[PDB]
Predict the structure of complement inhibitor.
Amino acid sequence: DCTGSEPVDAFQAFSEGKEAYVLVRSTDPKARDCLKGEPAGETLPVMMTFKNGTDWASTDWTFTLDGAKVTATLGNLTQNREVVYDSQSHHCHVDKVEKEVPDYEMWMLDAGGLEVEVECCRQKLEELASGRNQMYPHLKDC
Ligand SMILES: CCCCC/C=C\C[C@@H](O)/C=C/C=C/C=C\[C@@H](O)CCCC(=O)O
């Protein structure tokens, strides 16, 4: 059984903005290597850390949450997401990145993820991605 948290709430899916999450699956071929989103004080400020290519980089995004929907902004760049699946204990979740041809991402806790729940997120990402190639950004010499 892989029934997640219902109704899906983005604030609950991110452990109420108290835990760091890592990008582990993505249908976007330009997905950031070793991407990790973590709390950056206090809308909801988020610090994104990633690699491009050998050197580490970091940017400050501002999240605006409303139910399952998540709007992230950096300067004048805007990205819209919807948390389409969240596991029982908020250990992982799957986002639909809203654009002309939507992408799907799997995010999981940087530390303390329950295997059965993480596997349910992997299956939900497989279902939504279907045959589209799934990048594993956390396996890029992180
Ligand atoms: C209070 C801490 C919150 C941590 C939660 C992190 C990710 C959740 C996940 O569902 C949402 C991800 C949103 C990503 C938004 C933008 C990224 O594409 C930016 C990548 C880095 C960049 O290119 O600058």
